[model samples]
Target chain A: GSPMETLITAMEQLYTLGALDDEGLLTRLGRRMAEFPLEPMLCKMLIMSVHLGCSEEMLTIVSMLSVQNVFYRPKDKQALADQKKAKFHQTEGDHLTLLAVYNSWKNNKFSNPWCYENFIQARSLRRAQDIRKQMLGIMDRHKLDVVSCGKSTVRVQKAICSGFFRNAAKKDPQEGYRTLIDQQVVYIHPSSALFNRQPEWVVYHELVLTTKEYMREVTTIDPRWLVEFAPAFFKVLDHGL
Target chain B: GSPMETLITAMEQLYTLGALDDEGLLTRLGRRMAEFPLEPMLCKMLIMSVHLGCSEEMLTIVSMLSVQNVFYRPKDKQALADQKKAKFHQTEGDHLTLLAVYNSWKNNKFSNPWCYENFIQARSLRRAQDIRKQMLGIMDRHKLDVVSCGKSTVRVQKAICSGFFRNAAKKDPQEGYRTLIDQQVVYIHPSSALFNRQPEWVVYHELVLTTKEYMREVTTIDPRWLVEFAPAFFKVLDHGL
Candidate 1:
């Protein structure tokens, strides 16, 4: 039901037909996708899980994880602090989230590796113990089998992208959010925590990527406060989106 | 004999009578001590039967090891690289030398617990194995006794003299070294290893240290060529002098 299959099919058809002329469709789809961006590594990790034979579990996880920028609706300091204390489980930073999630799941073992396992599992502690042992074994093997752990979270992912020599985008100084990536303008994914912090560095370095801008409750928070709002919302939007 | 009695008595008298009012006689005696500039800890290790308790076999080993650093002067780049490698041994950067010395001793424990024993034990393969086993037993009891093993080589002796704090100096941008302590200026020991690499950050942060600016051999070095020597030699005279 997602547009991904349609997009992939379009790309496949373009490859087969030899026309290479779907520019119109691309422009339209690009506009939509850019408008409400998904997390960058989110797509890559899901695709990797598909390859790793955990498609079902991965799909269940991603469907929850992939939702965009929901944690703090107001996008202010107070909301950010509230979300942090809520234990909707904060990983120290974005990078630690996936590993922490996986560790938490393995620690619980068999009792519903799903979203609400915590309450039900205490009933049968013995079952929980056995499940934990099994999950631990599976995790140990999985760790040994995987080559790279997809370690960088959204922040470092942006840093790595910046490091790529050919992948630079020119950052717009005045707007700061807009980047000129490969002659195309990219609204830096707000999840790029660095975007609002030192927007000038990206522009000076000419880092280019696809830019997407969103219109939200602008009146709720002052425009000048956007940088402060961006890092928190960016993490939520960056990872969840 | 050999002015040691004069020096020892003079020192003991200072402790006993507490009579020296000014730097005249004290300054003359200090000048004699300044000539050798022996590390206080190194001398203490010798003075205490700790050095005496060390077997002849052990003394032979430690002497052989200590001899290598005597005049084995390294090129600036090599020395820089060595320092960088040594940084991992830093808990606090200042503590790195102590840690390395400790680890080195622990790894070579079969010898007579003397400085010389370590030298001999490390050089001989069979002896090293024997020493490791012996050290491991001690380690097992104390749960890794690195601090005890490392204490002698560490700068515990110099830390005794509050007046030595007066020796804390830095290079005077206007001219030569300027000593500054608890409102007093004293002297630095000429033979201190830090006497060479004075201005380095690690050194500068120390009591009286030199800046890295004072240590450069030449302005640049290509990867291939051997270092040009004039600047380094000049720095020795310019900075060390």
Candidate 2:
């Protein structure tokens, strides 16, 4: 019965929508997401980071991704853009690549010339910095403990799945992965660093209808987290896929 | 001749379109704007800042306006939003009000908690910082000198008109101001500090088609500058009216 049909329609999303309490008021969980200006799943990931003591690392990545893409790939200089972007790439995923970029940018005193030399979009990074502050403000307001679990990859991936289980997909033997919810066959976007590896389980930020059903902002995920974080959607009877 | 038809179409705007030279090459002016991710006119304003020696002041205002509204006004808290916003009001203009906010935020060591207390969107200010750096980078790329002419209001106003002259509107005796370009009736957005004290001549950032044609991100511009900066559009044959 929420007045905001757009929000309710989005949150009415089975497990994702459970962010709202029965009375349609924001529960503690829902209120946390509502407090920040990010999508519910992204906000959930940040909140989960607070629980896992990796708020600092996850906060940087989420805020960095919240704005436009940080990589500046000029059409005429695709090869050059790839070379520059590759400098920040981590073997783990695109999310970690963003974390690396943010770390380097901060270490360099947020230099614009440095951003130019690195092929990072200074405009997006600046916005990311602003978002980081805002998210931190929300954390303080809600009394969520802001901590870091250092480079604990397991904690970060689990935190990500806490909010993004609905976006989970399983690989098909033949070709692209199929979304568990709507059963749509989707391909990992070409831009993602994880494209070639093709993890059995993956989570994505958005689906774009372009030349194909492409999932942008993808990250490899452990199948266990999908069932663990969102048991309501991913039934246990699936035998952990 | 650019493959980006939408950008070319927008660049085709009469005076604003001068981003392209007569031969369809990116003139020095057009190239300056192309280097930055802002409207052509705002880019012109920043370039003009290099000449007027107020690049610092103009940079703050332009970047501040480039992001989403810095003030967060919840619908249920209209009075509170106004009160918080009023605290930053400088009777001169909205542009100056933004300058005041930026100054205070900087003075306070760019504190996110301070932004929360004042109802300012810390995210917007962070992006503003990034944009300021990017614009400055563009200045250096073209070897445009970065200097400030202290607080010369005339220089700042003229610099704003260097790009915003096409957005000039004269006060209409009836209900609102009529734009000089199309003579369309437009009202100053209620959020503007200039809303109460409507200036006779003003330049705006964008036209919003709400219930009525409304000008958002407006600043008072001297009519003389409108004729001076955009001589072709605002003709002297009209007695510089």
Candidate 3:
């Protein structure tokens, strides 16, 4: 059979599994999600950002992840890159650091020289900008009022929980994080702003299986936000598991 | 002053230079272009896509370029990766190749296994989806109808010309492309779908200065489209001395 035939069969399987309806049409979530072409969870987060009133910051963070890696650490300029990258480092997590980089770049009139001096690639930043613009457009498409909550980390963290509650982990007293999924032990990425300053309860963007299980794009959040924002993914535990 | 101070001063200069108005607000074009966060030219193309009725396809192409590299070639599997990447190769150019990859992935229900077989990274594709979704949102914000011309290469190329006319190059008889900007001789990257085809008039997405100047994400286009789509960027040829 041709590649097209193989793909058709696979799609049929997904349909059989209820990913597609009997009419061969996408369900509400599927249709809305297909509209954005993003991970189902990320798309969900985007949808929730509208109501959370932090779409601006969510757009900034999402766009940053959507583009090429922002930090450019050349072999010869590793130290310089660290120093330059340090300028954007804010507490919270790598996500807020991205927001810091974006806000500063915008405040600086989106200058290429600024990107160069800061070890951020101009091309990457431009792409991030495109992502942000596109995100604002999406929010408007959903008829969501696009407004900035202005440095409200609580709203931002709650919005993150709207999608990432499943990735919640509690800091292990021994060293890293004990992920909710499969009780697999994971460590926050070394590059994450939350690395050394490990917060008790955190949510991670993705789990990477390399030399060890590692979580990237982490942010510290209150345990209450996790259960409150995504009750479907979490349960209220009275004191202990 | 530090680099931050320098950037702040330079931004003031741009505001004085009319990129920003008296209120330190971006000018009309600046405001609109800022809405897309892409290079000025690419953003112009995006806006033009709305008028051309191919914003959907333009969104796909632009989003593809906005994300990280799609094809992931590992050291040990370099040959395997090339072969896998070849399965998605369409002859038009890198731009069309990207569209093909995206459409197929969507048609395939965005399966990660499918991406693995095609040497495409699932993460990159997810990012592209976010970009595409964001692009649609932007068009909606501008009250532009979201539509697709669907395999109309002419419409696609013309839309591309709307922003990339300045990046056009003519085939040099000796070898390579003679770029319009500085008459710099350059070759299409080896990985480009248009590498061997080397059409007479081509527009490139980027100019990389490496061992030699290399044009990446190139597409064959008509000189007519160049003048038609971006009239302000082109003037008719007059009799030479």
Candidate 4:
């Protein structure tokens, strides 16, 4: 392969994301995305959250995504940990499930005992707290309103699809799921909220490769959200679509 | 991404690997590769193993790679498991490390106590045992010779390169390694034998995606072996004389 293949592939991805213009220069969106110390997609998600009235929830989910091992399975108390963890799962997917975990921790008075009883990692949650603060500070510095949708999960999921529309996938008849892009076969991680439930379409934060390709940090999405968020990529040809 | 992108990319890969001709028809090598119930690359590796005189070792590594979680890290005995796993690490890389584990188990008369003492997953290793026999049976039915390289690790690595040559990577100057095919940044898995040793060139069984893209089941190979095994993909530019 050409030595320039990586550079070319990256540019193509950025351009598809509207981060770059035809002349290969950074566009207005790209310039704004460059202001954040996050991946372009995550940064886009954050920037769009204010308009969607889900900045607060997006902050929590993004903060959780930044840190790993939020839930720890102990050597001896595996079943107990799993049982506690399942209590946090939401119907929407992993992102909503993470929000549930974070909200519960906050509502539980941020107590170490609460985390221990729930098999949650206090350090990871604490790090997430710190990251949330930093992100909020960044948003404030940019004069972006940090509004909340309260109980409206739809707004939060739409905010995710705004940036991760490229990761939209539909259920496969024979197996797990097939990614919209390249039709790559993938599966929902076993720990995900929607792992057992088959939503016709979903948007994932990223694809994980293990024994099989797995989608992590997923959320169920209405197919129309893909067109709404990524018109260039989902150019439609039919009203039925 | 285009819907046919996957198919096109697959055909390009097959062509580069000499499995398909200009007309997109299966070549003689492809026909032989189709005879096995394995991925085309793994099938190629198995076919090449017969002539390399490392068919037996290849069978074990392939079987182990087919299964997951060969070693179980208990929450309480994580350190003990790591200690025992480290003892199996060979400088050559993960393939050899897995072979070491399999050979030791064989020498131990496949006892459960040995697995228990080492914190190995008895079920996974037992499955690997079954897979090895099944693979051996496949080879015998196909009239292929089964031989071992004894202590000659080079032949085994060469056989691996013959099949996984496209997954070859070189050490990156900044961090991790870069795939030669497209310069994709990837890392040697933390559980791999060569994770700490930066071999200039290596061939990996597959690319794994987690928080980062990682290469798993890797083995260090002499760079020249790539040219020897995959002449079409590695068409030389100069002798460097």
Task: Enumerate residue pairs that collide in model 2.
Answer: B53-B149
lDDT string for model 3 (A44-63, tens) is 56656777888788888888
For each candidate in the order shown, give its overall lDDT on alpha carbons.
0.30, 0.76, 0.73, 0.82
What digit string (tens of lDDT, one per residue) describes model 1 on residues B1-241? 3221233333333222112223213232222222221332222222221223332222222232233231122464456544433432333222233324444555556344443422323334334334435433433453322223244422322221111221234455554345332322222233233443444122212343354223211011111111121122113222332
Q: After superposition, which runs of candidate 1 have C-alpha atoms over 4 Å from their true positions?
A: A1-9, A12-65, A68-170, A179-192, A195-241, B1-241
lDDT of candidate 4 over A1-241, digit per residue (tens): 3212332344456666777666545666666666567776787787778779999999998899999899988999988887898899889888989999999999999999999889899999999999999888878887878988898889999989988888888899999999888889999888788978879999899888998999988899999888887777885751212
The alpha-carbon lDDT assigned to residue A43 of candidate 4 equals: 73
Candidate 1 residue B168 C-alpha distance from true site, Å: 98
Q: For residues A46-75, could you state the per-residue lDDT of candidate 2 as single tens digits?
A: 878888888888889899888886887889
- The list of candidate 2 runs beyond 4 A from truth reads A1-8, A14-18, A21-25, A237-240, B1-241
Say which docking band candidate 4 falls in. Answer: incorrect
Q: Looking at every candidate separately, what fraction of the true A–B Cα contacts under 8 Å does it contain?
A: 0.00, 0.00, 0.00, 0.00
What would the TM-scores of all predictions be?
A: 0.21, 0.48, 0.45, 0.49
B182-236 per-residue lDDT for model 3 (tens digits)? 7889998878888767888888999998878999889888888766755444566
> DockQ (Cα-based) per candidate?
0.00, 0.01, 0.01, 0.02
Error of 4 at A144 (Å): 1.5
**lDDT per residue, candidate 2, B107-223, as tens digits?**
999999999888899989999999888777767877888777675766887888787877888889888999887778999988888888898888887899998899987778778
